[PDB]
Design a protein around this ligand. Structure first.
Ligand code: HEM
Ligand SMILES: CC(C)c1nc(CN(C)C(=O)N[C@@H](C(=O)N[C@@H](C)CC[C@H](C)NC(=O)OCc2cncs2)C(C)C)cs1
Ligand SMILES: CC(C)c1nc(CN(C)C(=O)N[C@@H](C(=O)N[C@@H](C)CC[C@H](C)NC(=O)OCc2cncs2)C(C)C)cs1
Length: 450
């Protein structure tokens, strides 16, 4: 509590904290409404308390670039330590300082022109299977849960690539793999307040995903490595096992497996929601696709980057729904950035969801307006207000892979389907309150052959 004076003594505005809890009860809205409202109410910069942890929100495009780009290596290197993680301490996105840079540059040779282009023929094989699955159940003519169908696609595409293991989640509605992956939670509430508990859970072996999902992979990612040793990602980590170790290999894998599944299916669900409620945009895209890939022609690496309107659509959706509600860097030593002292131990927070919807930088910002991304308007958009993939050395390592993957899936779907809203379809869309940005009710849409 003694810490609740920090932003008072520093002269920084904010909702005043309750003992122990901090500003926690404000998240009853949801982490996105809280932030939005705080922006409006306190202007450019403010402080709040995650239980006992001070978090300084910043909005200045300059000050943002300083902490994300210019001052990353020296002072803003790490994210918040977030729960009981155990061996997942070694995962890239969870690692800190030295073990990070090592892991980061050991893995960033993975998503590069070369690699990407090499993943295309494999990923585009599961585009074809997405078309099939959609068609079998458009016959039904009954609302389709996009997330399901997108999920199974997402699934097949990461495994098959980063490893080289086609797992066929698609001829298989029934699946030994996805079960383990995806698994009003008072658990993160009790830690996010009381972090003095955290080392206790570590000793007890209690981890944020059971000795069921990991004990699965422990041996399973062990499984995918072994058969290989006879006659990419899984590859490049074996370059380093001659210095990437046993569980270090497995922990990168889970981080990838998750990101590549969960994020990729949510955005693609959100986009199709958009296209369906904006049939004009859906048409314009379906033309561009048809103009670029004529005769139902299969999408390729170079044809994807040719597609300007598609990129506009992806971007505009990501403006409205940035699956990561905020970016964060823990300040590791005292600092004076753009005339603002920030004490050691503060968590600096960039509120991506809110800035993406700010009057100041977006005219009619609730409206889905892909045209705000055309070559004409493109350059009037600050790269520190628009941050769906974060920025600087700790940005999203999977960006390029994510975009192309989504687009490949978008292309084939549109080059053979139309999507309209029906009864169950939630209009307008309502985001769920929790950690990740999700639609509270699933995206269900009617699908028709072309
Ligand atoms: C559209 C889907 C995706 C969105 C919106 C997205 C967004 C992000 C954002 C905003 C960050 C944090 C940037 C920062 O903190 O400065 C991030 C970090 C990261 N993402 Fe992505 N991401 C997506 C897909 C992926 C994919 C496909 C992978 C890899 C397969 C991936 C792996 C990572 C990793 C490892 C980090 C931590 C990087 C580090 O600390 O070095 N995410 N993601
Ligand atoms: C307790 C039992 C019933 C279960 N709860 C769940 C909840 N669930 C679906 C889930 O996997 N969430 C878990 C979880 O780890 N959630 C938090 C901490 C995620 C952290 C944040 C949101 N990061 C994050 O994932 O950002 C997305 C990315 C962008 N680029 C690469 S990844 C937790 C609640 C088990 C599944 S099974
Ligand atoms: C706590 C209460 C309010 C609840 N929230 C939820 C939902 N929730 C926590 C959630 O959105 N979880 C989602 C989720 O993020 N999944 C988990 C598995 C991600 C865990 C991974 C290992 N997190 C992780 O470490 O990502 C690294 C990054 C952090 N920031 C940018 S990248 C899940 C539905 C896919 C259910 S109950």
């Amino acid at each position: 509590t003694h810490s609740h004076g920090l932003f008072k003594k520093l002269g920084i505005p904010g909702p005043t904290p309750l003992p122990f809890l901090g500003n926690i009860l404000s998240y009853h809205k949801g982490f996105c409404m809280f932030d939005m409202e705080c922006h409006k109410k306190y202007g450019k910069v403010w402080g709040f308390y995650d239980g006992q942890q001070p978090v300084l929100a910043i909005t200045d495009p300059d000050m943002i670039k300083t902490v994300l780009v210019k001052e990353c290596y020296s002072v803003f290197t790490n994210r918040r330590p977030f729960g009981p993680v155990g061996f997942m301490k070694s995962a890239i996105s969870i690692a800190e300082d030295e073990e990070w840079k090592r892991l980061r540059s050991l893995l960033s040779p993975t998503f590069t022109s070369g690699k990407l282009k090499e993943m295309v023929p494999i990923i585009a094989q599961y585009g074809d299977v997405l078309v099939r699955n959609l068609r079998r159940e458009a016959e039904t003519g009954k609302p389709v849960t996009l997330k399901d169908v997108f999920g199974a696609y997402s699934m097949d595409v990461i495994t098959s690539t980063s490893f080289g293991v086609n797992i066929d989640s698609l001829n298989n509605p029934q699946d030994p793999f996805v079960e383990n992956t995806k698994k009003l939670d008072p658990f993160f509430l009790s830690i996010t307040v009381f972090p003095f508990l955290i080392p206790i859970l570590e000793v007890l072996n209690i981890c944020v995903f059971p000795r069921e999902v990991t004990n699965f992979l422990r041996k399973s990612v062990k499984r995918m490595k072994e058969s290989r040793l006879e006659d990419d990602f899984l590859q490049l980590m074996i370059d380093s096992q001659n210095a990437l170790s046993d569980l270090e290999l497995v922990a990168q894998s889970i981080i990838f497996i998750f990101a590549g599944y969960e994020t990729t299916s949510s955005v693609l669900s959100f986009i199709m929601y958009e296209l369906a409620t904006h049939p004009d945009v859906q048409q314009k895209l379906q033309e561009e696709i048809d103009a670029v890939l004529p005769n139902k022609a299969p999408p390729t690496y170079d044809t994807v980057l040719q597609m300007e309107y598609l990129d506009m659509v992806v971007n505009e959706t990501l403006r409205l729904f940035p699956i990561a509600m905020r970016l964060e860097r823990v300040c590791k030593k005292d600092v004076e950035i753009n005339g603002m002292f920030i004490p050691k131990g503060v968590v600096v927070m960039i509120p991506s969801y809110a800035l993406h919807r700010d009057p100041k930088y977006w005219t009619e910002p609730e409206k889905f307006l892909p045209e705000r991304f055309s070559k004409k308007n493109k350059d009037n958009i600050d790269p520190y207000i628009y941050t769906p993939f974060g920025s600087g050395p700790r940005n999203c390592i999977g960006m390029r892979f994510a975009l192309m993957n989504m687009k490949l899936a978008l292309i084939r779907v549109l080059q053979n389907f139309s999507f309209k809203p029906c009864k169950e379809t939630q209009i307008p869309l309502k985001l769920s309150l929790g950690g990740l940005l999700q639609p509270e009710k699933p995206v269900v849409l009617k699908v028709e052959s072309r």
